[PDB]
Amino acid sequence: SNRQEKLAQLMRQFESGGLYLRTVSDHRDEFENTFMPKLDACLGHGCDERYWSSATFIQQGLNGKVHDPHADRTGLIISADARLGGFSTFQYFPGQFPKFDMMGAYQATWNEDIFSVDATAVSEQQMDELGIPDEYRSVFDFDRIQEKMAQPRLAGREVEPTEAKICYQPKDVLGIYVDVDSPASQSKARELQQAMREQGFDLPFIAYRGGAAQELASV
C-alpha cells in the first residue's frame, strides 16, 4: 500500500477495534535487525514468525500511555492483523508468556497457594481454584484485549502502558510514532520513516497520545 492507504487502514482500525504501538529506543537497531530480516524472508521463500516484539494496545478513546521513560522514542504503529502471543495490563517465542501476574495476584488476594504453581504453565481451572482475579490474568486473542480494556476506555481513566507480544510482518507496519513534545523523538522518526520509504514502505507520521491520534506531514 501507499502512504494514504496505510493511513486509512490505520485510522479505520484505531477508531474501531484498535491496534498496536511499539516504541523503540534504537530505530536503527529495529530497522536493521528486526524489520529488514523480516522483509528479506517475505521477499524470499516466505514470511516467517522468528522475531517477536513488545507492543502496547492503542484505541480511540483509550487514554493509554506508551512505554517511553525518557520521552524520546520513535516507534511503529502496527496493524491489528499481527500475530498475537499474549497480552497483559502489566529473546522470546510464544509459551514464555505468564498466564497471570503472580506478584500482582498475591498482593490482591494474599493467597500463598499462588506460589505452588508455575504462572507460565497453569490451567484455567487451577487459576479459578486459586481465585486469581481477572485483572491479573493474561489473555491470548485480540477480542479479549478489547474486552479487558473496555472498562478504562469507557470511563476515560488514564491507564499505564500495557504489553502484548506480537509478531508483525512488513505488511502490518502502518505508521511511525512521533512524540510531539520531544525533539529527539521527531529526529529519530524522521530517520526511520526515510529508511522505510526507501524500502518501499511510505508511512504516515502518527502523533498518538491520550486515546487520540493524528497524521503528520513531516517531523
Partner: protein, 78 residues
C-alpha cells in the same frame, strides 16, 4: 566467577542489590539475603518469571542472567 549482579525487591518497595554467580544455589542466594536483610532462608520465597525458585536448584537452572529482578516474599517456615 562468573560473578554477576541481580536485584531483589521486597513487598514494601525496598530494592536490594546482590553480587551473585550463576552457579550459586537458591540456598546460597538466600544466605546472602539473610546477611543484608536478616531473614532466615527458611522464611524466604524467591520469585522469578512467575515461579518460586526451589532450594537445591541453582541460578542457571532458572536461566537467571545479569541484572534480573527477583521478588522476595516472606513465609512462616518451610
Amino acid at each position: 566467577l562468573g560473578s554477576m549482579q541481580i536485584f531483589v525487591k521486597t513487598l514494601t518497595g525496598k530494592t536490594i542489590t546482590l553480587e551473585v554467580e550463576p552457579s550459586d544455589t537458591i540456598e546460597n542466594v538466600k544466605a546472602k539475603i539473610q546477611d543484608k536483610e536478616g531473614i532466615p532462608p527458611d522464611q524466604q520465597r524467591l520469585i522469578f518469571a512467575g515461579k518460586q525458585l526451589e532450594d537445591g536448584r541453582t541460578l542457571s537452572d532458572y536461566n537467571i542472567q545479569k541484572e534480573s529482578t527477583l521478588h522476595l516474599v516472606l513465609r512462616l517456615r518451610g
